[PDB]
Design a protein around this ligand. Structure first.
Ligand SMILES: [Mg+2]
Length: 144
């Protein structure tokens, strides 16, 4: 009986503490789609009421198919961004679009991270794509 703890994950969610409220909203919404996503973060304890799992940093590239990147002005200054930027720069040609899913959720005064310049963004601020935003993100994350 019961629920298993995953060995491999659909995605790691990379975010700085300033953006935790967005991540809390995202996880609940993704859990309310017709998918059973396997999601991980550095510390599940700060995301109560969710099905997310904790993962050691050194295991992320090996065990996560993709990385969701929550981008904001605050994020650009964070150690979490340092980790994600190094991760992105470690990737071979073609791997960036296959493994990175950047999300914007509020206005930014700063330019988007250099390494994400050719990467498709999930823009939560655009009302024109809002109705199916979470469903489409969940489908994207569920794919190999
Ligand atoms: Mg909207």
């Amino acid at each position: 009986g019961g629920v298993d703890m995953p060995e491999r994950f659909d995605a790691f969610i990379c975010y700085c503490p300033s953006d935790i409220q967005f991540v809390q909203e995202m996880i609940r919404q993704l859990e309310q789609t017709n998918y059973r996503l396997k999601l991980c973060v550095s510390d599940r304890d700060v995301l109560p009421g969710t099905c997310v799992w904790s993962i050691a940093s050194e295991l992320i590239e090996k065990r996560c198919r993709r990385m969701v990147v929550v981008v904001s002005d605050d994020y650009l200054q964070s150690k979490e961004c340092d980790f994600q930027t190094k991760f992105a720069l470690s990737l071979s040609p073609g791997a960036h679009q296959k493994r990175l899913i950047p999300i914007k959720y509020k206005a930014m005064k700063k330019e988007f991270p250099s390494i994400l310049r050719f990467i498709t963004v999930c823009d939560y601020t655009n009302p024109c794509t809002k109705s199916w935003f979470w469903t489409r993100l969940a489908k994207a994350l569920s794919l190999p």
